[PDB]
Amino acid sequence: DIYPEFGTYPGGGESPIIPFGSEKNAEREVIHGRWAMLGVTGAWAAENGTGIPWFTAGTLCTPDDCTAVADKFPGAVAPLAPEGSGYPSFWNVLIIEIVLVGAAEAYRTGISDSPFDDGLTVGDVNPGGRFDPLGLAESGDLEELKIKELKHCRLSMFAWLGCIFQALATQEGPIANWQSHVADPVHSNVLTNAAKGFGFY
């Protein structure tokens, strides 16, 4: 069996708890997983590198101050910024964020015409035409690789939901919570935190 766990891939199955409904729901699922995966690994890396929890990283960069981000990146040869000048600013990045992500979005979904105009079809999660220069889509069992990615997608989203609920309850951070649990698993758990209260009880 390809998918021995509880649920099954959309292509074949029944979706036991929630009905399958639209196929756009499956499109969203994959995209949510492909995103949350990047989010979870980014929160992991930010906690490991800087010790700053992900959920307050936005406090760092603000309209008045967005210079602190420059010195955070570990092992960089020169800063992010022009040193004292600190050209990077919240708005400086924001205009860049909105234009670049909006272009990437729209050329993905087909709100605007595809610039690549290379036969790629919008509304498919797996293009496999240009976004795989390495050819791992072409080679190997492509369907099995869709399965693995899906599994990683669902795991990462569930871990993301865990991360947000741990940020709400513990207020410490994902990796800080991981270190607390590993240092002592018996007396550092969700139920131990509930016994102590989540800061509200």
Place this chain on the structure above:
Amino acid sequence: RRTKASVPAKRSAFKANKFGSLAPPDLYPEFGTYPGGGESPVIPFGSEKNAEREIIHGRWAMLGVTGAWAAENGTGIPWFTAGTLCTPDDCTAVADKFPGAVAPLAPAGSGYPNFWAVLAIEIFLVGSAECYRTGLFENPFPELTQGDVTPGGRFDPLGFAEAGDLEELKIKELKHSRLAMFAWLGCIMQALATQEGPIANWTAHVADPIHANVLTNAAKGFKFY
């Protein structure tokens, strides 16, 4: 050893005599309808499995509501803090929690329910039963069907199912199930809002009915505003 294969001819210690239906011919005049007898009033019927899921959550929430009720009546400890008693450390306290108990789970001294001991027994018993109920493990009782919430063989030793009308009893259980689940939801929301047990909230609401309500505690912000 030879094969005897005699006739047991044993009867149930108690076997309820036919009592039929004790309900009106109309069976769900309440909001909504039982599954397999009409259209769901509001929420869409997710799957055929959802009926059995409703039954299981219902029976579990019945048992949970009665447990919180009896625990608070017998000890005064709220159900949501009763977990803090039996822990890997100092699970001795959880023992003497039953009013009138001739003996303690923890005899005086070291003798005691260990959390891990209790836990290990809990996994080995409840998980086994949970699996045997569902398609996991196998079927130790072939005469019964795994995946059926109403087996009604060895699981009704008193034979109320066959003694009365089966389907009215089924809907009666379903109504009790939905009532207890909604009551359980009320209990968790009350625990969140007031930080006091269900019977404590009941007593506060009956001593002075006009105050000690949702909106009275909301006037204080549920202790958060």
Place this chain on the structure above:
Amino acid sequence: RELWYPGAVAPEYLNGSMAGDYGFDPLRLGANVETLPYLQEAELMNGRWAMAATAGILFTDATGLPKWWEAGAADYGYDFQTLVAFQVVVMGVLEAFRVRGLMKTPDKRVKEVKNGRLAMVAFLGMVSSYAVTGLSPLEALEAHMANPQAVNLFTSAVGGESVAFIAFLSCAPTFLLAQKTLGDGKEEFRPIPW
């Protein structure tokens, strides 16, 4: 094909089919047919772990990190008990998966085999050199290259043992040649009967 010495006779169950098969099994450990795939996979595993160990020892030694025998005592983020619990869980899961895959089931294969074989020899060498001289592998190599003539295994504390073993290895195939040409090679017993 070339065997484990010029003039050797490969065992009948070692016909060159397996990768790295040089007809070396004097003690007939792989003589039983059903355990021979298991022994192959034990070789591949011990080789792979020795290869990884050789890499992690030589790089550690050459990068100034604590010595391989001392590396346990270094202060790490996680204590011994939690680390061994992590190890037990993850290696149990991974080895369960490896076992079930094994139950399910040329150039590169042979390459891997030879590499693992060299590694296991090299790792045994590192452990023995440390146990005899107390010098790490790169320090031991530098000591040897400084005075190659007199600084060696056969001049260490176990020198006479090594000289006797090399004499046994050098004089084994000559006796095997006599055994072949004089005896019939019709042994009904094997050095490990199972």
Place this chain on the structure above:
Amino acid sequence: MAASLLPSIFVPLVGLVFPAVAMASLFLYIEKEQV
């Protein structure tokens, strides 16, 4: 070092291990059917 190690290994080797293997092996051979 030989004096502090080898007795404690070889006395069980010759008086518990070798006897066990030898008796088991001899048993397996003696009871081995002719064919």
Place this chain on the structure above:
Amino acid sequence: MPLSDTQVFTALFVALITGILSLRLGTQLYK
């Protein structure tokens, strides 16, 4: 003066070879 460890282990390895030769002789006798 006690015997050196290398002396003990060399003699023991010579004994192991002698034991191998004894096994060869026993097998040859059994034929």
